[PDB]
Amino acid sequence: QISVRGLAGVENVTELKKNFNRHLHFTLVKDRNVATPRDYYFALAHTVRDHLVGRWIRTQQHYYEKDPKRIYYLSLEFYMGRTLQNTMVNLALENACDEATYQLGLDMEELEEIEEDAGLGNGGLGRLAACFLDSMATLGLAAYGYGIRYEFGIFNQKICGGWQMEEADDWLRYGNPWEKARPEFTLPVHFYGRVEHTSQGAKWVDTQVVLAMPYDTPVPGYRNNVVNTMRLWSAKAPNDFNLGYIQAVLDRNLAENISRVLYPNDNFFEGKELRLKQEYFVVAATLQDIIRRFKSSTNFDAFPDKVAIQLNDTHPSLAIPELMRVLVDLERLDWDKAWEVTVKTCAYTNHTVLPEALERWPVHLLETLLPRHLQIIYEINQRFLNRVAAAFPGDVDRLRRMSLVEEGAVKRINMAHLCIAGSHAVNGVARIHSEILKKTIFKDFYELEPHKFQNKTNGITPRRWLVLCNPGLAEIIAERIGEEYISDLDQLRKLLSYVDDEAFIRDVAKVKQENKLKFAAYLEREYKVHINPNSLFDVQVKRIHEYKRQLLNCLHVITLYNRIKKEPNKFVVPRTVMIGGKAAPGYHMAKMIIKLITAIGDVVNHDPVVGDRLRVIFLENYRVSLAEKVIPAADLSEQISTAGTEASGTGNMKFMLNGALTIGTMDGANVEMAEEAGEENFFIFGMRVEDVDRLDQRGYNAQEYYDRIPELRQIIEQLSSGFFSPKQPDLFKDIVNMLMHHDRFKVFADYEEYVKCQERVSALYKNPREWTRMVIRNIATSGKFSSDRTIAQYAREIWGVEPSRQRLPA
Amino acid sequence: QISVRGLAGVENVTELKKNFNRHLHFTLVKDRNVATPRDYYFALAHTVRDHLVGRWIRTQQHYYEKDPKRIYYLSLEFYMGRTLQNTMVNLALENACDEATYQLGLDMEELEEIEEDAGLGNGGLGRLAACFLDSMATLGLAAYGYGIRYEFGIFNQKICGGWQMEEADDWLRYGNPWEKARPEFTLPVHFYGRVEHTSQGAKWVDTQVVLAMPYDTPVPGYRNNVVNTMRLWSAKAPNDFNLGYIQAVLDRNLAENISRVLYPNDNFFEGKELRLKQEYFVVAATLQDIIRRFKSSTNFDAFPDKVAIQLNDTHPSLAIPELMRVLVDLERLDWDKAWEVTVKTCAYTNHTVLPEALERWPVHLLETLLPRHLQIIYEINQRFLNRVAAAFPGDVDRLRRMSLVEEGAVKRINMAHLCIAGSHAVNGVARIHSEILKKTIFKDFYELEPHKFQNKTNGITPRRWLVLCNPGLAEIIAERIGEEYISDLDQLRKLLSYVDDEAFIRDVAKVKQENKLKFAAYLEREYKVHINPNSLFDVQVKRIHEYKRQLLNCLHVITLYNRIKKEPNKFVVPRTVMIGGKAAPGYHMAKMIIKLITAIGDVVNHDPVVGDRLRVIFLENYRVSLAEKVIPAADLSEQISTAGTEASGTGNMKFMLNGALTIGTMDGANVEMAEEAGEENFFIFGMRVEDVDRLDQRGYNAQEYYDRIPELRQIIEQLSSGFFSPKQPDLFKDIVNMLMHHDRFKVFADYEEYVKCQERVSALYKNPREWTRMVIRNIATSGKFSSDRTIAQYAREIWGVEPSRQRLPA
Ligand SMILES: O=C(O)c1ccc(-c2ccc(-c3nnc([C@@H]4O[C@H](CO)[C@@H](O)[C@H](O)[C@H]4O)[nH]3)cc2)cc1
Ligand SMILES: O=C(O)c1ccc(-c2ccc(-c3nnc([C@@H]4O[C@H](CO)[C@@H](O)[C@H](O)[C@H]4O)[nH]3)cc2)cc1
């Protein structure tokens, strides 16, 4: 139908149809008279999977023969979403499958909606890992993603009475056709025990064994016939486990609980024992796999030439002492040689500066669970602090600040400090964040080893986040500049030549309008909600957190409501304000914010005087597959975190690529996005980082803003008095109290500038031609934010390998 | 190679080879350079499974169109064993697959050994269910087996220091290619709650829900293109279950524990709550499935014309009050109509008279777990006892004896009494057992309703238990009388014409000798044990229980040892004595017996004076796949239970079919086997049932036998003094104490007759020609013991359906 979806040749369509019917009969054991849409989805998924496997086997064979340097990306999270459509796009099968299914009397889009998201992540960090796997395959790198196969991913969110309720995400209920169990490659992982010192070094004995069973998922590159592997470990009890009889069998569940559920915290360190077990489990199993593959090509001098290990935050930081343990205790290398190998192999990416998000494990936990690792950590610390003392003699305070061991009521290990000491490269995820690392929290480390510190600005894959979710936009771009931009996003710069082209302006605006109609229809069908598709679609979708300032958006929404009630008969630009995202189950304030948003909607959406001029919608169960629907429909992207708190953001980049304008602070990657597009093509407001610092030095007093801004005072009075909660007048007192007395993120300090900037947005939206020209300037300069660019920089500057766009044979 | 294994035509062999390679590549995702034997097994299993599915779909379609009466066989156990070879035999693919795998450079027998047993049963009762499913499919009945998909089946037995150790039977570790998950047909099962009485009858409310997810396995008939279904339920938590957050997800394990593990008791009622939950779970899910299928063709008058439910012992007895509950509470039938329907639908098979094996559930358990069912049971009981009172006025003791409710310290429900009251037919499993039921434990019920009581003598499938496990014997029979006997075992009677045929005598003896060499080699390879293949193979394999009298075999073994030591230089017929079987983990005496057997072996097998004249071997991990190896190698079958205790036996029949002579008591089916073959062709000894009764009336005094039999006294002194346990002199004092003072099974009372009868066995074994002629007379008269005969009798006399040998189209 459209050119970017590939060819639908007669023989291909014919062969897909016969294999579809073969899988329906032989694989699913169904005849056509009793098959449901779910059966048809599975028949298609198996048909498409067959096209992967030849390429998957050939790719892994190629790597075994050529023996390139191997990249191991270790993460506790991979937020993959759905696989069917992505696979078709990357194999150029989308039009052929569409045609083949059409001829069988089926609508492929309907079948795509049946697939469960693989929701094995919380948000941005997990989704970055997914985009990176896509870019690594597309750039022909011999890369492996290693993680945990959680039985239950991020919870499904239901809203009941305006409150979030959590239910289990039973994503494997109907099976996962994309994975292949590899029980033959099962490996032991040890816990507890104690350390014996013999004449032949240390020995970790009396341990409890849990088995790690791998499941492999294929990761196809974009049209290059490369298929890499994501390997996810599942926990299994050994067969002699506890072996009255019946209870011993039932107690196998305790070992297997390790891979049961994803901890649903975003930017918050909770620190449960079960979580520590997850971290070690992934590290221990992965390192054995790495070493096995290295031996099948004992001289570990070449280890760093054949292996790179990238640590996605500190969550797999135990890789450092585990590698030391294996090399010293099992392979009998001397300490110094082992340390040299470890440092050259490992690299660490930091994703946050929020103090509450940093992992600091109590010593007593490590002592009980991983006593050998704690000994190795103490040794690392003492040798590291010996270097600090020689570089900065007499600076005793520096020694305390840089220690891996944190003193206090409870002694803790600072895992970030461990990662820095044991890695040859430490990077932040956006220029401003990387600078903040060097000036604030890692300042001491930067002064000792300036050469370690780098920036690698985040990106997103243009396959999922343009071609897949927004085919109409992809097509009109392709009509002008061809298809090469899909694996070379800098080519979007050519679109600047069409900024005064009337046909292109019309086409960009038409695609957006189609995306909005399609999303407005989706809302009516699945959720019984009616929205005006001519209104400005004002969208904030991301995890619910105080730093992201969903509350500042709420204040603006109530301001617009109060202005309408004050002057009912004045024209205002109609808006649909959409906010979506999950709160961690333990995060009370985040749950209260969700309730506030739905409470505002209850008043605004049923006021007859407002009409369809203002609607507030809480988008339920925000996840990767919902992002693919709402982002292409957005006009305005809300990226309004307090300057200094969002390390990068990636949602911001998704909206830029899909034809929304951005309102935001100079935070994270927003800064680089404005630099690429021009500040005149961005709605920037609020305090810069330096302004936040000056306000902290003087002391943030929220009362001052309350006293000087009548419109803000009115809102706080409405909240306190029960205007938005008539049956429970004091329902929002914790929100009011926080805003007035304990606001770490300075919501009131940015209120005035935000409202004024929002007025400029509305003024531009009244002139569609100029709105659309500004959009073209954003899309055209979004090329820097391809994850292909990000990964090429990791490859050359950290991993020491050269990317490639060359195709393997088909 | 051999004719009974079917044809290996060029096109079939070619097509199997290509599909084998297709599955290796596409299904297993392996190339040939890294494939292991396990991969090759799976590639073959998937190749063979493909041939089932067309037939499976067509059969189930045929049943939906014709709408025959449906037979539902409910069991807590299905002891299936391996499926690959059985499937090839029933589809006539064995030679073609052998040839196809040979051409690919693979040995099919080697690949068959990789398959795990489906060990979802304890012993005879579970294996009977498996044989019955095979015969039902072979006789073209529209039959469904319904049970539980246990995650862990009967434990794997290891012997360590001569003691049994249990380990978990993780049979699903590598996957099960034979099953198909059907999560689309998942059904709710309720527990706990309470009963509300409204004006609209009773209502069961406030319950906890567990989901039942079905897994379907194909059951092929013998060369008739019929493929029936075994449906096994797996337990799943609902998604709102317990919905802090993390613990609620982990607590899903409590619901799913229902289908976790088989209770490993044989002929012993343990009565744990988790076991009661298993019983209700299978019943509740199955009955909803039955009713759904009945509605898709509300007038329940025709229900018994379209449905038969057979209860495999009392384990699914809750089917009776569950059916009443559904018909009265949900469908709103009046009680009397519902009861009429229930009685005509249900039939009950009893498998034991041992008091400790009968299920008697405490009222408090039922009251808490299934309060509505307990109310229905009380109502059933009161109406039933009203009938007894009208038939036998004034007989108050009869009322107490026949009650469903048993009085005492704890009130209990007698489930056998429930089954009799709620079934139109009650059968025993061998003529002597069925008579015992009418004269002893169910005497009162027989006097009230004589028409209910039947016999259906057990049988075994000649597909698994001759063609599959003993191809050499099957072939030499087929050479003389053709192949028709495989589905018409009465045709073995024609072999009586060859009893004086010298070629046939030679061939029968040669097949046995080949089976013995092959088993002696198997022992050396897998277990490092060396046996003389010219010795008489004396075999007792069955679950370890006091009633089966493995201890009487032990006494004979020690008698032979002591006789050899007394007269070293006298000729005796060499024997290899093989005893195998599992003890329930809680059954202390059974575990002690295993230790005694290995202790006897430790003395006997290392005495230089004995030489290879006597060996005692404990066969480890006895299970269906080991039965298939050892039974064809046996010369002597030990079936030596105390008369009145083995309801039927089926191992006895397996040995008869495979060319062993039998030494046994007149117990269970042994009686009918001797009747068919002629008593002159059986080694019968010991007390009859009537002799046991006379001895019980007088009082069993074991001391009398000790005082009068010097050889028996010597053995007891050896046991007591520590001859068989030198480092632990009193190790066997519990065995000695039981034998002397508390022996319920009268081991000493049969000792003398047993030893004398064993001497007659040895005398016959010295004359190979006459031994072999007696064997031919046994094989030739074994036709009655086909499960095809058994099932035809259930069909005509209980279920009211006509069997058929007609083929469906291919
Ligand atoms: O249960 C636990 O103990 C536990 C659970 C989860 C976590 C956890 C999870 C995620 C994060 C986290 N830190 N930064 C992130 C996000 O990473 C994205 C990709 O670089 C950035 O674009 C975002 O700006 C940043 O906020 N996520 C931080 C901590 C920590 C502990
Ligand atoms: O855990 C529990 O509560 C529990 C577990 C298991 C059982 C249970 C299991 C099996 C049996 C049982 N009763 N007879 C049997 C056997 O059934 C065979 C087929 O008809 C006969 O050939 C045998 O002669 C007979 O011993 N098995 C009886 C009870 C009962 C309770």
Ligand SMILES: O=c1[nH]cnc2c1ncn2[C@@H]1O[C@H](COP(=O)(O)O)[C@@H](O)[C@H]1O
């Ligand atoms: O010994 C070998 N011979 C041939 N190919 C091998 C061997 N070892 C690994 N390979 C290839 O490389 C892959 C190994 O996967 P891995 O062991 O997970 O790295 C296989 O799919 C093979 O194609």
Ligand SMILES: O=c1[nH]cnc2c1ncn2[C@@H]1O[C@H](COP(=O)(O)O)[C@@H](O)[C@H]1O
């Ligand atoms: O509504 C129907 N139309 C056509 N075939 C049906 C229908 N319902 C059941 N069947 C057939 O009977 C089988 C039903 O399996 P069951 O529901 O487990 O008894 C299916 O495999 C179909 O072939």
Ligand SMILES: *Cc1c(COP(=O)(O)O)cnc(C)c1O
């Ligand atoms: C991109 C994405 C995120 C990250 O969004 P931010 O605005 O950068 O926090 C979170 N969740 C989902 C489902 C995403 O697709």
Ligand SMILES: *Cc1c(COP(=O)(O)O)cnc(C)c1O
């Ligand atoms: C046949 C069989 C049984 C029953 O044997 P009995 O001698 O009748 O108790 C038990 N277990 C297995 C594995 C069998 O094949």
